[PDB]
Design a protein around this ligand. Structure first.
Ligand code: SAH
Lengths: 265, 265
């Protein structure tokens, strides 16, 4: 009679919380989706071994179109767990799944776990200073989307940081790299010329947040666009004007050039 | 000789990630602070019992003024852990402690945990639509803080949601409720008269996130300002322009008045 939304965390199978692991172990059925994101630091096998339960993977369609035909029926007479990378209900469409549960007379509880939204604090940037968030998407055929550019503009002009998720084709495990994101933004800057993203723009790259050895780099596009940040996933951030303390952290921890202490503060 | 910043999570001892627990168990010395937030679901005991070590709790003073005198010295020849509520680097100034660690020649690692910052997802409001965040601070003597009122105005003008962290004075066992925050806001609205926060403003209250039964309520200030949301911690959210599915979740899951289902686009 109960459905548990459980977050798996940031990077590997140990990123789940003690609460989520113990509850998952007690569940009769366990589902998981890896289309909204991927636990790049682990495997389904390791997650399964860690929980000691068979895990049925669901596709985007399984969830969005048939959640009530696949997951909810079993929840009416058993304890069911639905695992997702990061923190549950962060992905835009997941919150409404709880409405579906209610409509089916199924009670649901949420078990939180680390999310990149909060994990980016490791970059040293003050969390309250983040503005609207966006996703950098690959252009396709005749479609060249650019809203993520306007988002950066709207945030920066108010002294706010912009968290940029990079395009992912999880089914094919194809990651957009920070380098590609920068190249794309420079291209968008070249058509719109709003003085938002240039070679002089300061940016921060966060790779493999959650692992014990993440890659935290800060600097100007002209020096980072060709730098190697390692394996995905990559997260890009275009900071607004920095507080001296933020800049000192980027310099001491993220290897940013001393120049930011006078140019971006 | 390493220092670990480990988050304990939102509500109780089980909100710590498995990664954090396994590392905490193998540390020689364990420190912690409980002034940056309130974990109303646990005690130090369960944490110590869970970790198997004795934990020395530090005051804001011990940390902000003597961290390099109390903690760092030990990390020079031992593996030390510093525990904090939620995620250690979210809405705290703990990130600066990593700089001190560096300057003292001590390597530090960050182990994330579920944070109130990403838990807002359980309110049904799209997390990417959150703009700048702010804190409703206790007025002290003649000093009456108000900047948080401007943040709401700025976000609302852009149709973005506003996350309002609530003040806390751990040494005085004072934890600001969503009610107290609403009163302070009406007072600020009374003197600024910007039509930003009134009896007709729609707000959302999230109390004790992380617990299995958090209080999630949405409605007009006039109706919620006198409502009992249970024990702290509490956060207050002032939504911006609502998407249809956000409104439906608020109504179906947070008990908001059906009339908010009607969105004026
Ligand atoms: N479980 C919870 N429920 C509601 N509000 C919470 C909360 N945990 C923290 N807060 C809010 O945030 C304030 C502490 S700010 C420190 C936040 C912490 N590092 C984190 O990652 O969550 C509290 O005064 C309260 O307003």
């Amino acid at each position: 009679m109960v459905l548990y939304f459980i977050g798996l965390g940031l990077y590997d199978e140990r990123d789940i919380t003690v609460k989520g692991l113990e509850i998952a172990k007690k569940c009769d059925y366990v589902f998981a989706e890896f289309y909204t994101s991927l636990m790049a630091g682990t495997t389904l096998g390791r997650i399964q071994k860690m929980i000691g339960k068979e895990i049925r993977v669901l596709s985007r369609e399984d969830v969005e179109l048939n959640f009530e035909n696949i997951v909810l029926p079993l929840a009416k007479e058993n304890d069911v767990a639905f695992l997702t990378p990061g923190d549950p209900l962060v992905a835009t469409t997941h919150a409404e799944l709880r409405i579906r549960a209610k409509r089916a007379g199924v009670e649901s509880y949420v078990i939180h776990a680390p999310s990149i939204y909060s994990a980016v604090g490791i970059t040293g940037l003050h969390i309250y200073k983040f503005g609207k968030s966006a996703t950098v998407a690959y252009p396709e055929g005749n479609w060249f989307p650019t809203s993520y550019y306007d988002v950066i503009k709207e945030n920066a002009e108010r002294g706010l940081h912009t968290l940029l998720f990079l395009d992912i084709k999880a089914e094919k495990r194809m990651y957009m790299t920070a380098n590609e994101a920068m190249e794309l933004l420079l291209k968008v800057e070249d058509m719109k010329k709003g003085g938002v993203f240039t070679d002089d723009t300061l940016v921060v790259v966060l790779a493999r947040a959650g692992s014990l050895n993440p890659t935290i780099r800060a600097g100007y596009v002209k020096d980072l666009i060709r730098e190697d940040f390692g394996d995905p996933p990559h997260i890009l951030i275009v900071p607004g004007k920095l507080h001296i303390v933020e800049a000192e952290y980027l310099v001491e921890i993220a290897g940013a050039p001393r120049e930011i202490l006078r140019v971006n503060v």
